[model samples]
Target chain A: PQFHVKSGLQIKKNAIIDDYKVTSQVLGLGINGKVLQIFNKRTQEKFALKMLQDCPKARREVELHWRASQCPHIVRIVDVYENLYAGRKCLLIVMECLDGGELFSRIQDRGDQAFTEREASEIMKSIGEAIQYLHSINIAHRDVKPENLLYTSKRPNAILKLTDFGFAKETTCYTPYYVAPEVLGPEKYDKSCDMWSLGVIMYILLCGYPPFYSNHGLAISPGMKTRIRMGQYEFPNPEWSEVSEEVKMLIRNLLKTEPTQRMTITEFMNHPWIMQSTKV
Target chain B: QFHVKSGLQIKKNAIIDDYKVTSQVLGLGINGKVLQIFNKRTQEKFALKMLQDCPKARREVELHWRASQCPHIVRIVDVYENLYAGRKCLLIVMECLDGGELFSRIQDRGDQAFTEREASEIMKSIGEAIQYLHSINIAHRDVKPENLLYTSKRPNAILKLTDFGFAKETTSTPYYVAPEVLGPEKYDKSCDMWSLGVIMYILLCGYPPFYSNHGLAISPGMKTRIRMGQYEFPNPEWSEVSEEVKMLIRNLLKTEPTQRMTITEFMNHPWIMQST
Candidate 1:
């Protein structure tokens, strides 16, 4: 759905934006709708540019961009402007784009690539810290998933950005599963939703899949029965033999049926896995 | 330069597509205060409307500015404030949606009625759009099938979420309205999720779990309905439907909102993933 442009938009073909040159279109559609790769034109500085789509959805994207831009740990929206294409009005949103798409996609593509709890902890710390900032601002990244968390590269140490704030809201409720039980019901939830999503993301990063059954439809009554019947998936006993018990407990807390009982993001970050600074 | 007009205009513009002045009074709502108009251009086009004076129209204009930023929302295009005969009135122009509403559609389309592919697509798109709205700090208090608009188009079936006048950034809809939106506390976006669950149930079962002939909107009615929230899915009758689809409907219609899956979780469901 994309091809490199040599001279369009008044820029030289393959010219870099501040050191990073246009490489590939990670996402493609309109000016503000595509994500492009960049290689440093001079210093080999690498980054990604996520163009914002100029639809009503763009407003929320801009809000998320602004919210994240406030923190350096989060991705930043560098520029926003209007551009005319084929007589159609569009928006061009530029931001620090990561080289890789999402941690979920990478895991799925590799078909069960495993990450030890210690290795997962590093990635989780970045996410936890970001979530801490978001919660501090009274914002909840409601839609936290592997697909929304991107890596600079597939490497474990690659910086991660919590992208796609499409459903984020300011609330104390974290969300079910990763969220606390009291906050889970129909009541008003808060920033805790982001924490819950973070837990799910952490679980996915460690297990190569979401802790839950990854279903799409709203869970109906009978459907819950099916889930209960399916029971919790057991980890690979051999692969997990060397893993620590705290990691296991953390996963259990996150995957708990009740969201309120789960651990907070700050608490998770301060856990032994993150604070101890050990290799997997 | 911008002269404010009072009254409805039957003119077409970039935002107002297939605009027409409807003299035919389809029905009335909210104590006959709202007049429903039928757009002649689209065969089944209808919009519940209210007329206001110049000052009121201006307030609506400001609200429109704040609300139009999201697509799941219904957009008010031309605001006409003019004297019709002797009385001053304002007209709010809106888009034409063919498929009546998700509520009526669910009833019209019986158990295992809608195509699984179509159902999942509608659910996911609505979820995405709702998520977007929540992200922007806008709460859609009313999230019933009656508010969900549908287009005959494929893929983009164009399920436009509508009716934000009653919505607030903090409060959920009334309890008699839906269990999720009940109570007078500051509710989060989960209220929409709860409503979506009801919508999904209505989509699969052909009726809402909490609908009664009683005109009174109260908590007891909702409580009774919530208590009896069992959906019957007979096999062989719905043999054409996939098990995964049935599983999805069951999951969405859970009694507990907390147990009800989140939007992202719903997106990952096997039914949605394999639905298409």
Candidate 2:
């Protein structure tokens, strides 16, 4: 059954901003759609509204939100209201406003900053716990780069929430640099695909850079040569001298090409690094 | 009327030197008639599932014969029905997985939460297995965690599809029973796809798609509700899950049997067929 929306509601005035306040431009186009600020006069809460554009590409997104609601680690969708803005039909999603900003932004702000083992452990633990929980439920958070992990405030220990389920699926997709080899082939994938994303997340958390850097130069096909062999990157350079061998092993296990051979959620949780880290 | 013995002594049999019983009562199947015994011969392991003489057990042997051709599936090495304990019983010799059910392994790994690639790999293996089954027009009606067997390894493990007791040769389970079966009121290969969807969901999600607190669906007629339209998908709170995978699931969980992807079609989906 198709979801029908009652039309003719005008866009709230205060919510419209011809120019983005942060970047100072005609509202910058976010990844999925346009980001607009909206105010809920009833609860006096402000929310960042995303108006997804209509197209064949956008339907998959609508389906994504409808399905992703089943996952507990994900942020809640308050409503999927439609509004007529400038004579255009727009699908608006009301979401929780996180004042903390993106994890990537935080890292960028702390140039030359170093985290203690305890602090690193706590941050990684939260990400890992959320990932483990998601995968346990057969959900793959495919886009797990730092941009998706958000903090509510500047406090490192503040509530770190994973947002942006628009691309998340009950199954998984190929992002070769972070995806496993078997999935890149004739093999089919399931929730274990999330572990690969988790591994990428861990790598970024520890080194402040992704394990493999692809400036959109890679092809989007499955093959050992095109993906794995072509985009070869490593962590053992002098730049990674300070990283512990224990963390390296953890990545190795998660990044296994074979799904059946990869480390599971229980194994990940019980790993020495994860077990000792406090889940703050 | 069939009160079968759970344990058996093989000393009286001439094949005693060829095979030795390693463990008693590995498991009970077919209403406690089939006794799965662990056997060792020349240090090699094999499973000997003994079934009591019954029309149903005998019919199951015929089904096994037709299903034995697929490499991705379990093969029945031999079948023999003889008198034992003053009653007729059937013995089925086959490869012993020893690695146990994928369910146990999933549990052992603390819910065995998989990453995107890993999940895809499992699905690919299962899809390949199902593809083979559908190619020959065989249907694995009972596709559950218990039926999906895996080796001792965690990731990179080999999967063997087993349990053909409830399988159908020409017909299939009710449409509401599964969505993948394609045909008239009966079914074709699509039914196995439906079961694969259920299996995939259960493997990664840790539960069946159409489960209820009460065992009402046990009866034959009520099975139709399993494929009622609007089957729920992963909820919004599951933000960590990628959207591409969700889209793939929507396709697999389609209630309309005809709309479900074919084995070849499914292999082409981004999660299944896409390259990184």
Each candidate's iRMS in angstroms? 17.1, 20.1
The residue ranges of model 2 lying beyond 4 angstroms of the native Cα positions read A1-280, B1-17, B31-41, B109-112, B154-156, B171-188, B213-227, B234-237, B274-276
lDDT of 2 by residue, A1-280 (tens): 1223424223333333321222222222356786566666555566666677655545555556544544344555566655466776666666666677776777777545545445666766767766766665456665666677777666755777677665556544667689874565432355555666666667666666655543444432222222231113368565467878898888866765435556777677777787677544
State every prediction's TM-score relative to the real structure.
0.43, 0.41
Task: Estimate every model's Cα lDDT from 0 to 1.
Answer: 0.57, 0.59
TM-score of chain B as predicted in candidate 1 = 0.60
Model 1 agreement with the true structure over A86-105: per-residue lDDT tens digits:
66645545566566667666
Q: What is the DockQ of each candidate?
A: 0.01, 0.01
Instruction: Give one digit per residue, the lDDT tens place, for model 1 in B1-276.
Output: 012334434332422344444556543322223334555566545454555455544444444445555566555554544555787665565655665566666776665456656667767767766765554345676676766777553445566776555455542300001111122336455567777776665555455556554755656766677666754655545546667766666666666665665554666677667645
Q: Candidate 2, residues B7-70: lDDT per residue as tens digits?
A: 3222334334355655566555543433343345446666677666677676566666655565
When candidate 1 is compared with the true two-chain complex, its DockQ is 0.01
